[PDB]
Amino acid sequence: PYKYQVLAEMFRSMDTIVGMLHNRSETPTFAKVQRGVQDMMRRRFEECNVGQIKTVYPASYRFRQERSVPTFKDGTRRSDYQLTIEPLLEQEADGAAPQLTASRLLQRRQIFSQKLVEHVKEDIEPAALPQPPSQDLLERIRAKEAQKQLAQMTRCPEQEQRLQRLERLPELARVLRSVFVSERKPALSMEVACARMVGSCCTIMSPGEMEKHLLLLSELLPDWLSLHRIRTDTYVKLDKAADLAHITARLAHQTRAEE
Amino acid sequence: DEVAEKCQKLFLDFLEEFQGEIKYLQLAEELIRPERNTLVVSFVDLEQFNQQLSTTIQEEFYRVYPYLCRALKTFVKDRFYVAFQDLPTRHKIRELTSSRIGLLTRISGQVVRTHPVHPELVSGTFLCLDCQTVIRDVEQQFDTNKSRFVDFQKVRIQETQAELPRGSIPRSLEVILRAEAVESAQAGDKCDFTGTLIVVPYRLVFLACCVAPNQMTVKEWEKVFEMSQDKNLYHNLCTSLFPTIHGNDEVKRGVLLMLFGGVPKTTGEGTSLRGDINVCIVGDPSTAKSQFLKHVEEFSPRAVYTSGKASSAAGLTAAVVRDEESHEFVIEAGALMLADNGVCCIDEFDKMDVRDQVAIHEAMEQQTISITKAGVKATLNARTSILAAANPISGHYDRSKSLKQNINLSAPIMSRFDLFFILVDECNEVTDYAIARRIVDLHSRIEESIDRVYSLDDIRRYLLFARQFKPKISKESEDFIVEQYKHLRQRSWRI
Amino acid sequence: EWVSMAGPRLEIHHRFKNFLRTHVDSHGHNVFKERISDMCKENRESLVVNYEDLAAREHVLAYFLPEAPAELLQIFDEAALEVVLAMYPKYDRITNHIHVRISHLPLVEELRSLRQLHLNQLIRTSGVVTSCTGVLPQLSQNYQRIRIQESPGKVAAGRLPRSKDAILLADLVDSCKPGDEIELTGIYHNNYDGSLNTANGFPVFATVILANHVAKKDNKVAVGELTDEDVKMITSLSKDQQIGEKIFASIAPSIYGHEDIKRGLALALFGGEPKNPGGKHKVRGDINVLLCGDPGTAKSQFLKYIEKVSSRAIFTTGQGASAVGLTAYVQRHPVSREWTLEAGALVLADRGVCLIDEFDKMNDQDRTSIHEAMEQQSISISKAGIVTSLQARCTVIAAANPIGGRYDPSLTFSENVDLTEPIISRFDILCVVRDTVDPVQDEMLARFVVGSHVRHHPSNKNTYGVEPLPQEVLKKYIIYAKERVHPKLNQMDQDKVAKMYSDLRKESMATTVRHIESMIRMAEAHARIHLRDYVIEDDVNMAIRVMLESFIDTQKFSVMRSMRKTFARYLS
Ligand SMILES: Nc1ncnc2c1ncn2[C@@H]1O[C@H](COP(=O)(O)OP(=O)(O)OP(O)(O)=S)[C@@H](O)[C@H]1O
Ligand SMILES: Nc1ncnc2c1ncn2[C@@H]1O[C@H](COP(=O)(O)OP(=O)(O)OP(O)(O)=S)[C@@H](O)[C@H]1O
Ligand SMILES: [Mg+2]
């Protein structure tokens, strides 16, 4: 039939384009195949006809949805899925990578024509392509609640501030460990260490907050971390051989106890 | 190097045992694809898997990197380049010393210049011209058919403004990108590069491997949520953002709004609608104007300050300068394009020449700048919000003349500012008392006279969280806007 | 390497000889014998062979050509030479070497797409020529060194155009000119340069393409690229009686009102037919439009839309456009240090459209060079001992703002704009836009703007009453109309236009030939809109109407009422 003849012709064009793309270590994308077919046959190319091909002879190709396809300076975002086509070819006994030689091209078009003849002897439904992945009483009640909550918050605000900092300590401890690994030094000053931690931390913080956090770490965990007052400055020395997982467990236990 | 072989074996161990699923199996299988030839490895996984290997790689990266590539090739062949990411330490360009040669460190900077892609020969197959002997696998110390070539890119970077010490020229560094790192960086962008500082014949050059551009803690997230439910959040933010400035809260509201900003929209016709706000302030000398500029500069990390007359047309947008080594013409960035997706503050806007304001014109509305000078044709993005400060023609606002006569600004310039405030100074006793007591209290009680409802960092976090939302306009808002604009336009500064 | 074997090499040589002497076209004619007879008649030195026929007949040759280009091409050149000697023994006296040219390579790649994988491979590329050297002899031959940049229309915004070098030998020498859009098929080879190695500090190879076939990128290729479905859709649109209404309504959907400006811009975009009567004087087929308007009328939006729509478009600003930048200039090459020409914006606007923003900002010295290109559509550069002529066939759209920011209706159009009379005379269509406070027009503007704002939200992503056409369909229609129609003015009544021109003189001296020429090319363009081989007088009537509307808009208020009363016959 005329429709089947067009199908066979565009199948030959698709096979030629896929062979040309694959023979040079280039991943055949749908857009390039469509562009090549449209230039070759001056006819519209669309996924419905590809699904029809897959219905006819599914063994021709493997269809996958893949990311990280470099499209040069086309402004394409990485999160854009692309439909790739991989030819299914029998592996030779010579050990070389399979290549779409003209003999294989002729074999494939002949097999497609034979399948078309068999279908006639029996429109083609396309195959499903893999898709990408009083007011006074209320006011007095509110005032009573406010007074009760105020009496509740008469507790020192610092008690909860330390608790807030306790959640931040483990990550800061890891960062401090990494800084001491990077600096190749046994002791560092407060200023440089705090500046580097602020310049590497995930949260914007003031140097004073970092100093208080370091003091809290020193007081909670003196065996790992030691502070020495020299002249007019305090220097920071740490034991690099301690296990980080055990320290994290100890910090979690301390935070639980403080709760 | 025996330690290099030990590192190779340990890298094989990490590749074969890291997990309950091994993360790198799928990536290694994808490395078979011809377009994929570099493997990305997290540094935190390396340090948690083992510490001696992590320290050795951090200390002798150049010594063991080819052995790492050999290990990767062996692992892939059982069923290529190695890239590392997520190093937790950030460094400054001024920190780069000779003692750090060979260390795996990551550097933060802004890309200013780029160079085209060049093929670099790694291993060359040489044919002797005397005895016709083929010499293969010859490494290069810095037959084309059988030799190996690797793509190259040259990048020139410049120090960031924030890290720049006052009175210092921002030094420039050359960056080498290979294989998948090529063309991954664009001029005018700020990037963090992971790699090493190598010694070129001497000369200092940094070799890089990678580039950089729900999970927030519970208490910070809950503090943001709780403060988002405050009914007086608007007034509290207005008071906290300017604790030391008395009155003039309308300017405070305007600058807060322009900090929030709107949404940009691009039509189906390809035309982009500006989602930013431009503000002009004109007032008598008495009223504080530069203080707002200083406050918004110190608060917003993405703010740029400049003077009026001292800035030329070339220095604002861009300039065309002939490159010494390349013997060609390049473009040097201006202030406006460095303030991309930020705020630019201009002081004494009146003193600027018209020849400069006409250059500003394009960036004001079209949000882009185009250059067609000396055979150089390009267009550049200028996505900026402009905050301008100026004074009337005479130092004193003379009421004997009309409002239009008092401002010496061109009509399109007047039109292209969204909010336009005019400040007039008056002699009132209560205002004098309030201003005097505030000034003296600040001068005598510097720290204890400040009561901030919210921390500046908290405001910054809330602003970062809020800016990514894109609200929708309702039909009630639609017809309300229609009728309000009907009434408004029915009445110098034409609407 | 396998090709280098003597057996297969010689066998393929004789197979190519049999292909040359045996192929039969669809019409039963041996094409290559006609081609060789033509080349012998013209005494050329190159033969052109279609790659498609070779691929259809011998697939192995089509596989081998990209893989082993140099050896196979030399073998084919020798085969062609010996075939010519056998057929035309005397042809050795006129030529000693004949080269085979490969045309229509299916694989077309861009300059940005060049990698190492294409090294020493035949690649087809497209671009625009910027600079060229002279003819240089070699102690082997003719040499040509040219510099090619990417086409500005294809280049995305915000990214600089990249440049590459090409080499031409013998016949290909002097086959192209700077500023000419061409596509090339050539070998992507690498060159050894120690200077680059020393500067960069490592081995760097400068990749230079050695072109085999040169073909200028005329719109014939675009005509071939047109789908027959596109042609049938265009023809079905052409037979529509309301095609003009929907075409005018299809321009600037986001902008409300302002029928006259979009009408004039569309009429200029379709363009007229350039003519060269007798080879003595050349009559331009281009329409120059100047747009003066009160601020707040979205002139820059119109310019941006025109920039996007046009297949070839260049945007320039008033402040950033110098005379040297706009035109071609002579420069000494930084490496070889011979005088070289770098094309300006107008030169790259040849056959395309050039947009000028804030034309009232132009320096008078920069204005001086403009008149030559406006009147003759060609530029003659006489600098540093080099005299060259380059084509400047472009449609120019200029924007300007009135002095003081407001248009005064009590003054002449010449007085309100700080431009000399010749510059305005070079312009063909003048459209002035004012700002009026009309409550109903304000309602319409507000409603349309808010509707457009609602429609074009990323989350959510007429006056004539006709549905606008799709952008792609409109672009295809524009291309086909530009490349197919050539109207003939065989049914024009000269008496009516003569009387109208006499009245125009009477009413202009109370307050030229190029106005008549502009009206003529305007009628030609309007006929081209309807895809008609011959011009109907309705085109003339519409051109007269729009030209008269443009002219009266440039006059003072005290006389435009009398002008409308006098010419109410044609305005009705
Ligand atoms: N509302 C206010 N609250 C506190 N201090 C104020 C206030 N208004 C003015 N001042 C003081 O007045 C000074 C003037 O501030 P500026 O912003 O430099 O004035 P200015 O209007 O910018 O004049 P120019 O443009 O620099 S000549 C400030 O630094 C404050 O010390
Ligand atoms: N008639 C209109 N219909 C719809 N939107 C309009 C209209 N006129 C103006 N606008 C909008 O107003 C915005 C700003 O207008 P502009 O293009 O800057 O004004 P202009 O007429 O070009 O004068 P200049 O060059 O800016 S001094 C445009 O981007 C449009 O979104
Ligand atoms: Mg000031």
Ligand SMILES: [Mg+2]
């Ligand atoms: Mg405009």
